[PDB]
Amino acid sequence: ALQEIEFTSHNGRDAIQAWAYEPVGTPTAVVQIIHGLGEHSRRYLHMISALLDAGFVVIADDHAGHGRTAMQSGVWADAGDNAAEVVISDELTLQQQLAGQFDDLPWVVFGHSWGSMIARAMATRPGTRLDGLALCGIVAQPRGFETTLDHKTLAKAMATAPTDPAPEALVAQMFDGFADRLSEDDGPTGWVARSKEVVADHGKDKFNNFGAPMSTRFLQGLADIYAMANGDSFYATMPNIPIVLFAGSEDPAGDFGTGVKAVAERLRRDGHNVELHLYDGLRHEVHNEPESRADVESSLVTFVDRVAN
Amino acid sequence: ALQEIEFTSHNGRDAIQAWAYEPVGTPTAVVQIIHGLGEHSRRYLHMISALLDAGFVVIADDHAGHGRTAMQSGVWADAGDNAAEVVISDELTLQQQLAGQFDDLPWVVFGHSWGSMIARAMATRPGTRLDGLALCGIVAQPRGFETTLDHKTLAKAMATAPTDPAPEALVAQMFDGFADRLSEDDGPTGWVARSKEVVADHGKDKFNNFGAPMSTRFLQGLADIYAMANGDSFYATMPNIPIVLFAGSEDPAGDFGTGVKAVAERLRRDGHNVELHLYDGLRHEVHNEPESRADVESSLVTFVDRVANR
């Protein structure tokens, strides 16, 4: 069965476009997919079908400024003021759309990229439905967020022109070093996947519209959520539930595996239950990379079944 | 990649809701899915994903009176006047929504149930894109359309009240014998699948809304497309292309296997290239039956690859 869900965003502007997918028979879990920057939930058709095949309910929305939400509002790469709280609030609202349908079932959040940051921030909030946390394309200690992005210049832009397009200089700082292991023929979004076919399709997909100029307030939202996901308060408040991590060793977002190993090691030192899948030689979208997609999906099913046990 | 496509129906009322699904890499074929009565195209997620895995573009719409088209228009189980011509015209117009994008690729039509009848009706038309024809849940020789449905009573209803709800007697006659191999607990839609799970999901899915009252003119479109799909012109004009048939032996729509055998036999007699998959013990939706889904999909992929190879 298919449900179309719409609700007003926390930003009061966007009709959030959302879908629930129910398998045949009696489902054993709910998986909530949280897409990343400059993409959309219906890009996950393969994964959704694999999870339905496993007996899970899947629920996903196109965030503020993204996908069909952007296509219907006409607003791309902006989510309103307090953009981090908007997209966190809307992912909570999404859970409430199934209230009284699957209340007895375990609930896993799978977040990719910006989605890994939204999933991490969500996790730390009381009231969130969360029995297991799965993170993919994990943004963790990249040079751009950690050091290159100039908080003083951003703060001046936030004070004077929050809703205007983000200055190019600031945007470049956020992506600093993302092309450090690419060739010229990989193109500037070569970091998305080793597979040129995956990258080509990413750049064609009208529901991605990747590279729509972001607003200054949307860039502040990325810097806010980064600090919410990688900050001391994340580690201090992460609940004692199973966690699984999927990343490419060749992904700049996770500082070429170094950032992702540090997340795993800090969670482990703090006594957490952590499963790490670090794909050697693969780039950001290990769930879309033809070498790793089957392994990510089968590990994700195994993980949801373990949460359920 | 994903495209949302909408066009005005041939009926001049409905915004046909449609989608194109593009695989990563260079596609090798296009597959048009044509859904059946009281269902919708997004029900085919498993199949679409499998065809994408195989390097095929997939294109599908919710027909007039169906799925998201009905949800947006508020009109369920009616496709306007000349309903058979409307749903055929709308499938040809769907093809043209990709004009210039995939002009070099072979095009396969996959049609389930009512869609098997739409697909067959399309194949007889000059300028249809059709490099291979795949039929599922085939409607052929069931007693209801063949004998029980009273065309004098249908003509009276169309003369006097074509937009009224179809008289319950004509609807009963059209479906006569569909529960001949069902128990009371299988319920009236038990013919859909052996799997009680599949039938329950079919009932629950809000984009099916199976059982909304059809209009009289819509019922006339089903009688009309039955004749277009199964009449002598179908066999006499069938293109020199590969054909694959998938049906369950316990599917009343094919006269419990007997009608599907009649279709394959007549095409073979005339020298056509026919592949028959008749699944013992299974009912109508062999693409959704857990026992046969993998076989229907893997057979369809190999079939499309053969069409492209040719």
Residue B17 in contact with residue B72, Cβ under 8 Å? yes
Q: Which is it for strands A56-61 and A15-21: parallel, antiparallel or unpaired?
A: antiparallel
> Distance from A149 to chain B by nearest Cα, in Å?
32
Tokens standing for residue A221:
């939202």
| In A44-167, alpha helices (H) | 45-53, 67-73, 83-96, 114-123, 143, 151-160
**Cα(B92)–Cα(A208) distance, rounded to whole angstroms?**
29
Q: Which is it for strands B29-34 and B107-112: parallel, antiparallel or unpaired?
A: parallel
- Locate the chain A residue with the closest alpha carbon to B290: A24
The burial of B93, by beta-carbon neighbours within 10 Å (0-12 exposed, 13-18 middle, 19 or more buried), is given as: middle
**Cα(A181)–Cα(A236) distance, rounded to whole angstroms?**
34
Give bridge partners of residue B64 from the DSSP assignment: none
**Cα(B293)–Cα(B124) distance, rounded to whole angstroms?**
29
Cβ-defined contact of A24 to B195 (cutoff 8 Å)? yes
Q: Which residues of A touch B206 (CB under 8 A)?
A: 1-3
Residue B82 in contact with residue B55, Cβ under 8 Å? no
Helix (H, G, I), strand (E, B) or coil at B185: helix
Backbone dihedral angles phi then psi of residue B193, each to the nearest 5 degrees: -160, 150
Which residues in chain B belong to E strands, given as ranges?
2-8, 15-21, 29-34, 56-62, 107-112, 132-136, 242-248, 273-279
CA angle, residues A182, A187, A188, in degrees to nearest 5: 80
Cβ-defined contact of A1 to B205 (cutoff 8 Å)? yes
Q: How many Å is the maximal CA-CA distance in chain B?
A: 55
Give bridge partners of residue A56 from the DSSP assignment: A29
**Cα(A19)–Cα(B45) distance, rounded to whole angstroms?**
13
CA-based Rg of chain A, rounded to a whole angstrom? 18
* CB half-sphere exposure, B310, CA atoms < 13 A: 17
Question: Distance of alpha carbon B150 from its chain centroid, rounded?
Answer: 24
First-to-last C-alpha distance (Å) of chain A: 25
Backbone dihedral angles phi then psi of residue A80, each to the nearest 5 degrees: 90, -175
Q: Which residues of A touch B46 (CB under 8 A)?
A: 49, 52-53
Closest Cβ–Cβ partner in B2, B23, B24 for A207: B2
Give bridge partners of residue A254 from the DSSP assignment: none
The A-side interface with B (CB below 8 A) comprises: 1-4, 21-25, 40, 42-43, 45-46, 48-49, 52-53, 68, 71, 195, 197-198, 200-201, 204-207, 288, 290
**Cα(A119)–Cα(B72) distance, rounded to whole angstroms?**
33
Give bridge partners of residue A108 from the DSSP assignment: A31, A132
Residue B269 CA: distances (Å) to CA of A299, B133, B235, B274, B300: 51, 18, 10, 10, 23
> Distance from B146 to chain A by nearest Cα, in Å?
33
CA-based Rg of chain B, rounded to a whole angstrom? 18
**Cα(A100)–Cα(B64) distance, rounded to whole angstroms?**
33
| Amino acid (one-letter) located at B96 | Q
Q: Which residues of B touch A1 (CB under 8 A)?
A: 201, 204-207
Cβ-defined contact of A24 to B49 (cutoff 8 Å)? no
- Quick one: resolution in A? 1.8
**Cα(B258)–Cα(B251) distance, rounded to whole angstroms?**
10
| Amino acid (one-letter) located at A128 | T
Q: Which of B32, B38, B18, B30 is nearest to B284 (CA)?
A: B38
Question: Distance of alpha carbon B154 from its chain centroid, rounded?
Answer: 23
**Cα(A193)–Cα(B192) distance, rounded to whole angstroms?**
42
Length of chain B: 310
Torsion sign across C-alpha atoms A224, A228, A229, A230: positive
Q: Which of B112, B37, B41 is nearest to B76 (CA)?
A: B37
Cβ-defined contact of A2 to B52 (cutoff 8 Å)? no
Tokens standing for residue B207:
């984009």
Specify the experimental method. Answer: X-ray
- Locate the chain B residue with the closest alpha carbon to A197: B25
